[PDB]
Amino acid sequence: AKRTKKVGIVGKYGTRYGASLRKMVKKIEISQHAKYTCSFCGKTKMKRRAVGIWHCGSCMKTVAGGAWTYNTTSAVTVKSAIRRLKELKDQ
Amino acid sequence: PGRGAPLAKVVFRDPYRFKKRTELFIAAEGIHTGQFVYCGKKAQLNIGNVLPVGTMPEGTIVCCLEEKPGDRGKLARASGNYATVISHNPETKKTRVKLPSGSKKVISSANRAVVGVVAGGGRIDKPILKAGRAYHKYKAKRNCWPRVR
Amino acid sequence: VQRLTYRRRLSYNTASNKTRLSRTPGNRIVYLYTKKVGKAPKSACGVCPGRLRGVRAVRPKVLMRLSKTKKHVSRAYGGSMCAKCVRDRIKRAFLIEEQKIVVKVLKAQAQSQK
Amino acid sequence: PRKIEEIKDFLLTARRKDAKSVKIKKNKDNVKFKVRCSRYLYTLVITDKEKAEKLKQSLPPGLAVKELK
Amino acid sequence: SSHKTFRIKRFLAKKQKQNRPIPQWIRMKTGNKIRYNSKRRHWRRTKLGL
RNA sequence: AAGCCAGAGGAAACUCUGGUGGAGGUCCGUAGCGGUCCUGACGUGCAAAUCGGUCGUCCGACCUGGGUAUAGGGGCGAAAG
């Protein structure tokens, strides 16, 4: 059945810490414990090992990523910017 | 331990004797194991390469930037941070960068730096939520945590 | 039940004080101080997580008295690297050295002009 | 201890220079010839009663033939 | 304790040897003025320095 | 708690039910650690701070041995001089 109406994963915290702090940590805890699909083998086994370290069980590929998400939106725009600058370094 | 930024073990070939050199970089976000990095003047713009800021485009952003030409990385080392190359001048061999605190600084064009932002992302976004989690965070760093007013 | 005692002067349940129960021919249970559990070598590739096969799994100083055959496998890198990651290296070394011949021939027809 | 299965290899272990004694122990089902070497105690077990008698009379000279009964 | 050093054990050896009554014939000596061993030490009454 | 299974209702959007799972500075409560109340006992005591009952916490900012470091206007202090 549906066991919790709205708290979701942060039901482990009970009533503590305040509703908005539990809600803020809810989206982070969902992404932090999520299993992403590895872009090297295609298996959905890329999971967080430590903070900033994402490791794939299947292909044993470890990649440095975000603290909670597999890759942060900041570094995504950075990679596009660097690619744009490299193709602009030559003509 | 005591750091939010992951480290990278990178193995080079020693050029003067038959040996392997094990360096401990600071991981730029996006690097992975079994990936080649290239350090030198002639390296090209890729995430993880270590090349001088003088041989960079006018807007590239760097990860572990030296303060003095010749030492090792000293700036933008904490997780998610980065410097930004602003401008050069071939006269006087200087390069202006934007430090994470927004401070502009003039450094030599021979200062090396990783290309990219340092991994570890937005670690400060998650509320600690617990006196215990702060207790464990500072047990890895130094005896400073319970702060009496 | 017949309760037991330690047979040495180490009275704490540390890692070097593990015991197992043994029934002597005198029909009494006594402690027997076990050796530690050894592990087979990990692969030198540092990628795959399994340990090597065909190699006796003992403490490091037991290898000093083991036979040579018990400590390795009859193959190149045997006893130091897994078979799977050796085949990859044989293919990789061959194919990349083929690539160098390709770029050498490609520049060979590129230097036909002056 | 090392267990000896056949007869002729028990002979030259018994005639080895470091062999000190031979003990013959008769059970309810077999006879055991135990030769005491420097390192091991080699034991040969014979179920046949007549085979044990022949081997006992054929034991090498200059060696203890101690019986355990 | 059971685990002791050689230096400690030898120290206790001297203390044990000299914790004994005076010989009986000492009192017969001329100009004696000694009645009993006044340096007697009991293990429970007083403890050793070490 | 998340995750997972099956079933049902719905024109869809989506919802509901029963299991499974075993989270948590989670609750009751031992050992441990602590020390609320009786302002109980004792108060030339068993004790230069203990005892009885009742109690707080009991997977964690948990309890603990040993090895180390910090020394007097100095140390150390989740702070009471």
Added chain:
RNA sequence: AGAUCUUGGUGGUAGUAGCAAAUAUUCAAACGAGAACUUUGAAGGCCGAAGUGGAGAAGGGUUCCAUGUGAACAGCAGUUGAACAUGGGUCAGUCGGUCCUGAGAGAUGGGCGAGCGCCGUUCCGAAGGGACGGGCGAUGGCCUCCGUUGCCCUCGGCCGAUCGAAAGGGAGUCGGGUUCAGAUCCCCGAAUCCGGAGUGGCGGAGAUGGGCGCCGCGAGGCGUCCAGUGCGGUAACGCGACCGAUCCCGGAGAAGCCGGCGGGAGCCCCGGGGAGAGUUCUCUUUUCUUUGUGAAGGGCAGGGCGCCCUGGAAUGGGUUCGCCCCGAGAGAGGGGCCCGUGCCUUGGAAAGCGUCGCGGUUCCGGCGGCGUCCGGUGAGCUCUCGCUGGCCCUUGAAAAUCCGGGGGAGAGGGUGUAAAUCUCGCGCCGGGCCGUACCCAUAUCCGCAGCAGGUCUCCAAGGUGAACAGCCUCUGGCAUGUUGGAACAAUGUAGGUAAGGGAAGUCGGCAAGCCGGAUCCGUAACUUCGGGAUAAGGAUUGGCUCUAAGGGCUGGGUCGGUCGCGGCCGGCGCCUAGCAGCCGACUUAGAACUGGUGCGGACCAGGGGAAUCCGACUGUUUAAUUAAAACAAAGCAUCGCGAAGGCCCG
């Protein structure tokens, strides 16, 4: 004569307070001058496996153990003693230290310092004293020839002395016996690790085959030439060795906490067979005890695998308690490896144990007989091993030490019963130094003491039960905690009960009392939607006799058509709604009967509700009068600082 004078001695108090924490003693006998206290026996009890049991670390230091004394000490006594006296007792290659490094400590170089010195630990050092290798040599000497040895060439960063763990890392010893007191140390017996062998101890491997000329009837022989630093499997990998330096790469050492399952053992439980006891007023084929196989080899079960080969899967499938896995190769078939602490075997029964005897060496490892058996269960408990998960802004040592691989500088013999070499089998020699007794606590330690305090761990039986709870018991232990006897006043301390009332007592429901387990129902306001919540409230609960449901193993034939009273395949048949027999757990539900309505019968075991103030919560705090509203805390906000820097020590 004074100074709360100094020192010493002595009174009254006073034969007084007191010798009251943890249930408990009694009978007979012995020794003895003497017995509440000693010892033995009988009984009644307690600790009740988280012990009042059996062993250790720290600490003590002879308290250990015999014999003797009865002065003093053991707050009564004592024939007893942890007292006194006299003797005796601690046996190691494999148990520790010793070795390694850890947090750290600490020299030298250097710097400072009036100076003893102290800063610093890689920093501002010419910091390698070593190496198989090759050469020049002295032929030191069983001068054939390999060991010496001086020098030279080449190579050589642990880049830092040294110390730092009797709980970390760390090769390799177990079974039985023995003493008044010691044993993994002695003795008996089985092993094993490291080191060594100069003349090299023995085997085995390397390694001993082909081509051609001939002899010889062929077989088998002679001469020449050529290889020969092993071999097998498609693979995983295997076989008994399997040449190899400097150098390089890697592994082991070497890893947190928590959850859930599975394998193995030990214990516990049940059914029988022995042996010995117990009860027998009656019953009870009954109740109790006991019923081994060490290390190290070999073999086989079993457990695991992120190992291999075939093959190519959607109508997706396999599979777990949970998960999870698959065209990056599922399912299936066939293999490989690791662990093997389980079983068999060598050890091994000769020993040990239980019983029944027979002799004696004041006091025999005496001798002898018989046995040391077959089974079944399990969410059981404790270890251990494995698999798979979860948690971390926490990611959970280091170094000695040992090993594998890459590479191929070199070495070795000219086909000899060969050479260099060997991580293979067996054989030979050695392992020095220090510790080792005992207590480890309501009496061997600290607390002035035989002090209700404090002091680090290991093992862990039956019943009830959710349970390592409480309560009763077995193994083991003890004598009620520094005295006993007689009485049963007051006051007390600890524990109960109390008619009718029910907080009227009191500053205040202080204290006590009520409630309490489990099952079935039933649960409000409010709320951060998680909670409140065991809300509140109600019913039931015993004993006995049954009835249901929840499982596991085997076997399912139509037949001699023939014979190796049974099978090589099939003429020969339709469990295909599944049956047959055997075995075995607890649990749940339903019913009848029955008791003076008593039944969570002891034990264990929440009083509840409505509000107000404060602190969010969990945590912490004035050891010895304050546990709080105080501190901390996450969260929020501000400040300084880009290293020639901020803050701080000196």
